[model samples]
Target: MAGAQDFVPHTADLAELAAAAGECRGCGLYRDATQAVFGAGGRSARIMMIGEQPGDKEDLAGLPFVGPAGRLLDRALEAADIDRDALYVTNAVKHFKFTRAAGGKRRIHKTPSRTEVVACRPWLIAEMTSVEPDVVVLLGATAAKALLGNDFRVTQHRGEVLHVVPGDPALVATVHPSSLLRGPKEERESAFAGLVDDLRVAADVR
Candidate 1:
């Protein structure tokens, strides 16, 4: 039944919220994860970026957006003139969901099932409410659908920003950095160009 939101109101700030996330049993993810990778960056940020979930490296580092994809994200954001030191970064789900190979030490990432996303949603909702960003960037379909509705296709509206209610943050959906990493070598540059183009919208947002 109840989820993390039960503890939402009791929290006074993001620090308290993150600490509470450490003990969250609202979902089974906390059981196998190294630690809950909560949101990081300035609380008063005008922009908030949400990713799918932590990857193997992020899980181990106990920080959000620090792995290969994170590095790519940093570069793209910097190219767009979006300052990471000034914005909040988080994930739709806090844990790294993965399955290991039969005998290998490598852990293969598994997408977070909708149920897990449901369980972690309260935390995200609480985070958005607290940060009250002027613009919210959805890094992939998982995050875009989580807030924008399931039918919202990232490909179609990648660079388009919508004015949600007067006080709410405007929304923009874009490809995840990992997508740039996964495409074929020849297509990687084009993929990267598209990503940077979409990210550029944020810099002109204010």
Candidate 2:
């Protein structure tokens, strides 16, 4: 299969692309998912924030960054003094990959596989190309690796402004807001502060 490239529309319109995503047979994840949770936010945002994928709430709502992680992100963005209205939020993978819990009720998130990431890459590329943001903030290791490569370590370089190649937007890496939710309670505040610092750095890019 041609992955998402096979199903993606030949246009730069995000709405068109989003509509087409619902029909994508690019990977098997779409089959189990309720709908493709495409990226949302300003079309001409200066900062594009990308996460790993949709969570349980996002999956059900067919939106990105609308769960607990989303709330944390909002706070961080505000703490950083970055205008939330000017940010474009998206994910590395469009669909939610999950496994049923013991009672077959709770949907536990499963990280998208490399193959799935690859399959969904076209959609991401399309979004980036169209938005052409001044800065791209990767929300997790998965998002960092999606563009920076498998070896890019967010832990080592989380708040640094990087320009990997000429003509590419400035890049910054940070822990996904969801990580804050799962981290040690004592460390959550400090970790969240670090995330806000990272966003501040991203916001500084002209």
Candidate 3:
């Protein structure tokens, strides 16, 4: 299927890009999601934090990083001495993909397929070009692979810096906040500490 390149406008203005994203039918994702949740934060943000995709709360609220995982991220950012306001936050896939539990109302998040991630690359690239951040912290494998290719693995490289997009802002890979939530209870604290450490690396680069 045709990707988001056609839907993305030539302009670099974030607001304009956001408005245009709302109407994008670039892939089948928009069909199931509530809306295309665009990047948010200062236009001149020094860092861009990208996640895999919107979660259930993000889908309904039309914002990125407002769910449980996001709260953890907020704390982690603070711990890492990274100022939230100085960062532009978004997801690799603008839409939320989920599966409802049988006979239940809850919508469980499903990881976006590689095709979906590739299809949504234009929007991510547009945001990157507009923000021109000094560093980009990719908070999961999907976000990493979106620019770093399908072979990139976050587990092996989290906290390391790489020039994923050819030039300009450097990229840092890290685990998604949600992973800590789903990991072994005994290991959660260590996982969280690792996340904060990764963020510190990104903050240091900036």
Best by lDDT: 3
Model 2 agreement with the true structure over 1-206: per-residue lDDT tens digits: 67789888888789999999989889889988889999988678999999999989999988888888899899999999988888888999999899887777568889888788888999998898878899999999888888888888999986788877224999999999988988677799899899989999998998
Better of 1 and 3 by TM-score: 3
Best by TM-score: 3
TM-score of each: 0.92, 0.94, 0.95
> What tens-digit string does per-residue lDDT give for candidate 1 at 129-184?
77888888889989888888767789898779876422578888899898887867
Candidate 3, 1-206: lDDT as tens digits = 37889999999899999999999888788998899899889778888999999889999998899999999999999998888888899999999888897897668988889988988999998998888888899988899888788998889986688884724688889999988878677699899999999899888884
Give me candidate 3's TM-score against the actual structure: 0.95
True-structure lDDT of candidate 3: 0.89
Clashing pairs in 2: none
Quote the lDDT for 77 in model 3: 93
Candidates sorted on lDDT, descending: 3, 2, 1
Model 1 worst lDDT run, 10 consecutive residues: 3-12
Relative to the true structure, candidate 2 reaches a TM of 0.94
Per-residue error at 108 for model 2, in Å? 0.9
The 10 consecutive residues of candidate 2 with the worst lDDT sum are 158-167
